[PDB]
Design a protein around this ligand. Structure first.
Ligand SMILES: N[C@@H]1CO[C@H](CNC(=O)c2ccc(F)cc2)[C@H]1O
Length: 339
């Protein structure tokens, strides 16, 4: 379809111009008031902040340079910021500013007050097939966009899908995203979502994102993931086995799509065949989906999150509030020169 082809050609031109000349140093810490911690991690946290002059709210991701180095995430952190400042798509959280100081790296993103898909899924138990299909269609279009730019995402899971005020998805956390034209080798991702070729230490490609979509659709429609077990070693054994059990309430069309996404042989997996993404878009499970209307945000969403305004944090959870310290001496300057 020439209209999709010309869309993706323009998308790649615009991405490459920003990729080749990344923006740097577009804000500073004392232009923001700190409001609340929204999430934590091994080397960083995300905080709700308010810009002092405009009053706008943002989600500020703060990474400690010394911890990034110790946990061997330097390349990944540079990938994350360089990719985020270059992309533009309706279902991706937008990077608004970035900067660094003696101690930390900062990525200031749009704030999405509806919270994570994960919270809403675990509260209701499972989504109906139409509800799962609405979110799945947005991921299919997002992966078509990213893959056309030679980007692998590598972190699909319900916690990384935020729900906006119109009920649409915004994908966040580009910590494992990478520009890859062929194969890549790093072990990364949450256990339940890993493709077999990652578990087996192979050189793998963008087909791992389509496997992860299969896991996400199964979990949305069942309420639990397909390879669930109590410990990672047992999860990994189930993933590599080539078997799955579907609930009887799944439609036949859903089962068929999932068998083709959760295909252990990556050379036979939907999304990775000669027709690429069109084997997924044209599948019977998606027959009711108007792909253009989803992209244009014209479909009424199945669920509108409840929140009081752009400063409401009620859909995120509570964490111990810790200082943001900035040393008087510069740390790890060489490693993060390009940030
Ligand atoms: N666990 C670590 C700390 O929290 C990170 C993920 N959270 C976001 O990316 C985010 C949250 C809300 C929002 F409005 C925008 C972005 C993760 O790396």
């Amino acid at each position: 379809q020439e209209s999709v082809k010309e869309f993706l050609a323009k998308a790649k031109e615009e991405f490459l111009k920003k990729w080749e000349s990344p923006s740097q140093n577009t804000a500073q810490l004392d232009h923001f008031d700190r409001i609340k911690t929204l999430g934590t991690g091994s080397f960083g946290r995300v905080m709700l902040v308010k810009h002092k002059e405009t009053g706008n709210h943002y989600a500020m991701k703060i990474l400690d340079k010394q911890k990034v180095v110790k946990l061997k995430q330097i390349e990944h952190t540079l990938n994350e910021k360089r990719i985020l400042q270059a992309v533009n798509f309706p279902f991706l959280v937008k990077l608004e500013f970035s900067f660094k100081d003696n101690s930390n790296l900062y990525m200031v993103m749009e704030y999405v007050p509806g919270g994570e898909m994960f919270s809403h899924l675990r509260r209701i138990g499972r989504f109906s097939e139409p509800h799962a299909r609405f979110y799945a269609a947005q991921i299919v279009l997002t992966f078509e966009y990213l893959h056309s730019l030679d980007l692998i995402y590598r972190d699909l899971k319900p916690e990384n899908l935020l729900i906006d005020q119109q009920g649409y998805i915004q994908v966040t956390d580009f910590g494992f995203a990478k520009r890859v034209k062929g194969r890549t080798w790093t072990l990364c991702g949450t256990p339940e979502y890993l493709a077999p070729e990652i578990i087996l230490s192979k050189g793998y490609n963008k087909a791992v994102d389509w496997w992860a979509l299969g896991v996400l659709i199964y979990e949305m429609a069942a309420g639990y993931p397909p390879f669930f077990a109590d410990q990672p070693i047992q999860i990994y054994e189930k993933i590599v086995s080539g078997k799955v059990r579907f609930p009887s309430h799944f439609s036949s069309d859903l089962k068929d799509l999932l068998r083709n996404l959760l295909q252990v042989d990556l050379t036979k997996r939907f999304g990775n065949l000669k027709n690429g993404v069109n084997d997924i878009k044209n599948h019977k499970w998606f027959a009711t989906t108007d792909w253009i209307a989803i992209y244009q945000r014209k479909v009424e969403a199945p669920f509108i999150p409840k929140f009081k305004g752009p400063g409401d944090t009620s859909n995120f959870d509570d964490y111990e509030e810790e200082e943001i310290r900035v040393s008087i001496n510069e740390k790890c300057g060489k490693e993060f020169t390009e940030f």
